[model samples]
Target: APQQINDIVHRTITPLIEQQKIPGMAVAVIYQGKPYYFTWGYADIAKKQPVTQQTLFELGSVSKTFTGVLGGDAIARGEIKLSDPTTKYWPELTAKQWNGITLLHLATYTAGGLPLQVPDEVKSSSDLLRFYQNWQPAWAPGTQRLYANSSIGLFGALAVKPSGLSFEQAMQTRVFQPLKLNHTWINVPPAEEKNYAWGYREGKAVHVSPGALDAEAYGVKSTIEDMARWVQSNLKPLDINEKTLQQGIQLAQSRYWQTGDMYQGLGWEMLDWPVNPDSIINGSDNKIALAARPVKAITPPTPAVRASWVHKTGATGGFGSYVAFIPEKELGIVMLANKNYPNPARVDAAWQILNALQ
Candidate 1:
């Protein structure tokens, strides 16, 4: 299996890196509970430093999955309920558009008509509150799945409000610590700065700036090793003998929406496994990426026989990352790159390796 995997990577991934001009990359595959890692190109191209399993890459919106996990935990602990309205947690906030939006609507990006990014005038907590207070929806709630960071960011804040913990604190205490993921962080510690990979845009080094609500939308940094553990945990969430943690994992991965070929769980996109990778790549094209109508929710398939494929893609101005997994197969793939590249390329490379393993 190792030789088969290695050969596939050589033929499939090698050419893509050259064709795309990726400065550096780190990839990992989890098979039957074991991890296989591969690295290519440079972490610091000028210095010629090679990427390693320890190199940290910004996870961008894939960070939403962590927020989903935290929200799930909050639900299990009775700190928050998905069915509860946003006004339940922040009654001070009042807007006609907020009337019908539930916590699950926000988490699933169905909070009708929220923009993809917070408006420029909304720069602080006061500004954010003001924006929402007067905000109005373009469409009715729960009728479409428009992808938006503002929706999830709002969900993250309200999800942690009842616990009186900041978003960063809640994620650490409820999700990261319990999973023993030492290398993951909202802000990489100063001592670990050496591990942080510098991203590039047009050959110049770049990094993501922390916005007011970025932690909930696109603010996770992690290493391939930590991501492997993350993929492993998703395959089989560690049974801490506590119902909350176990239930949290299930809730985060449960299917809550369907539209055409696109399916959405709490934080991850859901697809039936053994799916054609081209379909996965096509679904992420620009046209569908910007639309914001809620897809109709559907009953999920039984887990015993059909493999559930879940995934997320993320990118900052300079970096790109993609993660996908099939829990039933105990298989997952993670790809991180310093230079931003197309999502299809990432999907194609990972799918090729996964197909080889099978």
Candidate 2:
């Protein structure tokens, strides 16, 4: 299967790497819970240092799902509830606009309307507090789903309050450590600093610059091996040794709301199986990824057991990555590269590679 998948990956990705001028790519696929890894191009084009299984790439928004799993674990421990209002954790925001916003709204990108990112001026903790205090929702909470770093970034920050730990520490202790992911980190430590991959733009190197809610929004670095392990855990949650985290994974995977044509979960996104590559790709385009749209609640909520195209896409200025799993087939794919590519390019490559396996 490795040889066969490798051939398929090479055929599918090589053109994109050459035509798109991508610097490096690392791909891992899970078939029946077994992992196969393949790499091409270079993490450093100047030195011709090729991508390896250990090369770390920024995960962009895909890191949002980790916040969901963390929330799930907290819910399992009775430390927090998705239904709890955001102001419940930070009572200082007495603003009426903040009234209907709950942790659930924040996690799913359905907290009324918010920007794709926190405004540039709101840079510090005090700025963040004052920004919300002066803010008002464009629509009622739960009525619209507008993808935003502001909402989830705040959730990532406030959600960790129950643990009495910083978002970075709580994520490490609760999610990464429990999952046995050795290579993942919000801030790549000094010891493993060398493994961090460089992102490239038109032959010039670029990387994530720090911004508000970075630790909770899009700030995550990891290798294909650890990412494959995460996909494996999602594919086989019941196999995990930790029951609480297992429940957390279950919660993260479950479908909670039907927004437009897509289903929204805690920190994850879902689409019904046999979905087209275009359908999946279009969801990440401006309309859903950047603007608010109406959503219908899934009364009583859906559990994690279902056949769906469970996936997320991540991008930094210099890197682009994607992960998707078909639970019914026990199959999933991880695509990590050091150059940010268009959504159609990323999702189309994934679709072709997945289709080859059939």
Candidate 3:
């Protein structure tokens, strides 16, 4: 199995990197609870710096999953409830369109008609408040799955409101510090800045610039080792000793909605394993994916499918990342690259690696 895993990684990933001219990339796999890491190319191509497990790469929307975990923690602590009307936490959001929106709608991306990006005019908290007060949904709440950063960003802000800490601070205290994810960050600390990988676009090095909602939408920077720890937590959640943290992990990973053939949890996408790689790639394509289709919520089934898989994909201006795992098998994979490659490539690469491990 190990040999097959190595062969598939080299065969599938090596050429994909070269084809896309990826400057740097890291791959980490967990099999039977032990970690194995592989790296390729450069963190700084011009400087010829090789990528490593410790090199931090922008995680993009993968950051949403972290926000999801924090929300779960808040829910477990009785700080929030999935069924609570969002206006309960932020009463300033009194628009008629807000009547049916709940924390669940926001977390599951079903806050109907919320746009994928926050408007540029909504630059400050006061501005965002005003925007929500005046905004109207294009569709009824809970009637459609419209991928919206603003929806999740709003949910993350409210999820942490009861704790009286900024989203970043709540994550540090509740998730990262408790998990001992020393290399994970929303804002990379100055001392560890050296490990931050400068991403590339059109062969020019670039850095991620923060947006008003980036903190909860797509702001995390993390290393393969740190990510591996996260994967391990998902696979064996009881390993986390903190009661609320463990509760958060379970709640976050629970299946809550179905969009087309795929299922949505807080931030992870769950589907049956032994899946066709092409099906995964096709489902992840933005054009083909049904982001606006109405969906019904389902209670996650008891005696869950042991071989089911959960995964997420993320990208920034110049970077791409993917993480996936099969909890029954205690197998997971994390792929990070400093180039904005296609989601299909990441999905295919990971699926191939997982297939080999089988």
Question: Which candidate should be chosen as best, given TM-score against the real structure?
Answer: 2
Candidate 2: tens digits of C-alpha lDDT, residues 1-358: 5788878878888887887777789989787778898889888877777899999999998898898888888888898888999999999988888887899988887888866888878868889999888877888888888888988888888888988999999999988998889899999999987778899877788789999999888999999999999999988898888888999999998888897567887777888887777888777665556666788998666897567889888888899888988888888899998988886778888888877785
The estimated TM-scores of all candidates read: 0.95, 0.96, 0.96
lDDT of each: 0.83, 0.85, 0.86
Q: Sort the predicted structures by TM-score, highest score first.
A: 2, 3, 1
**In model 1, where do residues sit more than 4 Å from their true spots?**
238-242, 299-306
> Which should have the higher TM-score, number 1 or number 2?
2
RMSD versus native structure for model 1: 1.9
Q: Model 3 compared with the native: what TM-score? A: 0.96
Model 1 over residues 113-171: C-alpha lDDT tens digits?
Answer: 78888886667888989878887788888887789888988999899998888889989
Deviation in angstroms for 252 in model 3? Answer: 1.1
List ranges where model 2 is wrong by over 4 Å.
none
What lDDT does model 2 reach?
0.85
List clashing residue pairs in candidate 2: none
User: What's the distance in Å from true for residue 95, model 1?
Assistant: 1.6
What lDDT would candidate 1 get against the real structure?
0.83
Worst 10 residues of 2 by lDDT: 283-292
Residue pairs in candidate 3 whose N, alpha carbon or C atoms collide under 3 angstroms: none
Q: How close is candidate 1 to the true structure, as a TM-score?
A: 0.95
